[PDB]
Symmetry: C8
Subunit: 130 residues, 8 copies
């Protein structure tokens, strides 16, 4: 397909939601190529909105998938290395697909000199930096 | 089973809470598939919340799993690499399941130039 | 056991305090399974409090253990890799068991442009972000 | 072709937008070489901007590429190492092509000593 | 020996101070086991403090150990990996034993957009 | 050449702009050695300015090059390791050649205790740190 | 030696200044063991002061040494791994011996939402955190 | 040669400036040993400064060296590992020789909860 076809776009959203990657989806019978999908996205806000929803769902699906990829890895050096690459790629992508949920989490205990208060000295500007 | 069912959802939460993963909970007979569970979650805030707490319980179980996976790894190169991948995947996931509890922990001692006070100029 | 049994809970706390992991404890004669332990925790504040104390002690015990795991590792590739995994897992866990004591430690010397003062310019809000 | 041409430049943007890299776009017959494209960019702000947006489109294509490179890696030691290098190079590049979208994501919970309020003294 | 003893505790501190680990101190005849030492520490603030300072002394000894472990590693793959693990474990531990001395050290030059002043808007 | 020669300096800038490294450039017929190039830079502002422009262009050229080095790596352990070293070296250098463009990119969502507001307590100075 | 001996302490400072590690120094003819050195340090401020100076010099010496360890490594897998360990250990230690000089160096360009100004909203305290 | 000599020191700076390391400069006949150079530096501020600038020049030379070391690595496992160590050591050193130029570069987009404004409460 080249022309925008909502039924096809809807199927793409459903498959992505389940965790399937776009390039893999686009290899299925009757699907548009990825370039065409991105063109559809660019010109159709209805699709963009549903695709954004599908991306959130895709991330939640992948989050479960990474446990399976690790736990079921064939215990052969090259196969484990591949499983690691697949998991690392998904971890990286999840943080971008939903930063609030899957971004890194750090608690910073902020203290000052010698574990006392943070010491701050303010002074008049000494150069023209405005 | 596609239509939201408050009893099946409560059941899912109980299973997750006892350490079971979503994939296993859904592979059971009569259970909704993963896509359906996620849809339920999306369209019901009450399920979203109990599921969130079940997720924190799941995390506490996974935390104890990582010790076993590491300590009981088969001492063969690929099996140890696999165990490492299993543990690393769980560590990463734990931080997201309960950030307060399992996120990274850093203490930053903030000082200024040469260990003096932090120097600020404002316009 | 399924019913809450304080004497058993107390033994669990003592074993954890010495550095033993929960799943290993739960394999000992007469112990509840881990699911049951977590259920006991959920419903009994007396146990939760003692378990929190035991977790602090567990961390201090593990902190000593990591030296032994490294120093006594069998000098075989796979055994050293396993020892490393065991130590890395403990290091990660210790920071969560007692963040104040075992979290990362960084001293940040904060300076500004060209090693001078930190330059800050404040301006009226330019969008509605309140 | 050395002299700036508004149509060839628009063409380059369209090709980059469809996922094609600059090296490939320039290896085509009748196209400017890379050095010439960069010169054009330097001396025309209108091209700089459309090129920037084409770069963001390229990034969205590359994002989907990394899944394929990882999942379809040949399970041989060197081929997996190569796939890892290909993916790592793309991840790094993506952050620079669209920082808002593909940069690192961190949530920092900022607290003070012992989990109390952050303590500050000022002069 | 289970009951707190101020002389045995002072002894433990002296031994730790001279570089000896707790495991070794406790494996000695007549010494309390590790669990008992930790209990003492928990229920006596005076011991907690002298133990903390003995821990800083221990850290200074360990700091010099890492040079020896690295420089004198047997040049065999697994022995070097073991030496690396021994050193990495000590580096990590040192930061926690004396954060001021052995924690990470970073100098952050903080600037604003394009190297200008840091731009802040407040409500 | 030892004496500053603008035509040669100009050629150096052109080659660097295309992504070639300085030491490689200095091996070409008729080029000065690197020490001499740095001496020319030190004493000639016209060259320094053009060299700075060339460095920006060099970085943009290298940014494209890293894809090719990775994608075309010979699938042999040592050759892939070399390709990785070549790419990692370029990534590191690019951030220094143009920090604004090629530096690391992080979005920090800043929150306070328990995900609420950041809690700040100010107090009079308690030591002489001015 | 057990008793504090300034001439010996002075020699220790000179050897450390040249980059030699303490345990290696203490193996030389007539030197005290490390425990004794630390005892001398604890009780003699003259030695502590000179030892601190020696530590600064030691760091500058090691900074040059790391180039030699890397560049002269025997090109054998295990020997390169050992050289790497020796260099990594020194890099880590240098930052602690002289944090101002050998600590990590980062320039953070701080911007706000969408690359605009950093947006800050202040509010009355909503809990008792003073 | 132990006594500070202003001409030998200027010479050292010139050599370092041309890319030569201190070890090589000192292994030359008639030159002070490393310990003596460091002593000079300690007791003369004028030498400390010219040496600092010579160090920045040295850094600019080393920056170009890393490209050659990487690109010309012998494609053998241990030789590539050695080249990597040589490059990594230089990268680390460069940041300390000229922090402004060769330190790490990060752009931090600072936002508040949920991408809103950063929320602060003060006492």
């Amino acid at each position: 397909p080249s022309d925008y076809m909502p039924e096809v776009a809807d199927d793409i959203c459903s498959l992505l939601s389940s965790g399937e990657s776009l390039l893999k989806v686009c290899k299925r019978p009757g699907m548009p190529d990825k370039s065409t999908v991105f063109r559809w996205l660019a010109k159709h806000e209805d699709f963009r909105d549903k695709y954004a929803k599908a991306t959130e769902a895709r991330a939640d699906s992948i989050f479960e998938e990474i446990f399976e990829i690790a736990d079921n890895a064939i215990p052969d050096a090259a196969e484990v290395a591949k499983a690691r690459l697949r998991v690392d790629t998904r971890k990286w992508a999840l943080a971008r697909m939903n930063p609030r949920k899957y971004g890194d989490k750090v608690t910073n205990e902020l203290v000052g000199k010698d574990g006392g208060a943070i010491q701050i000295e303010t002074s008049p500007m000494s150069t023209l930096f405005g």
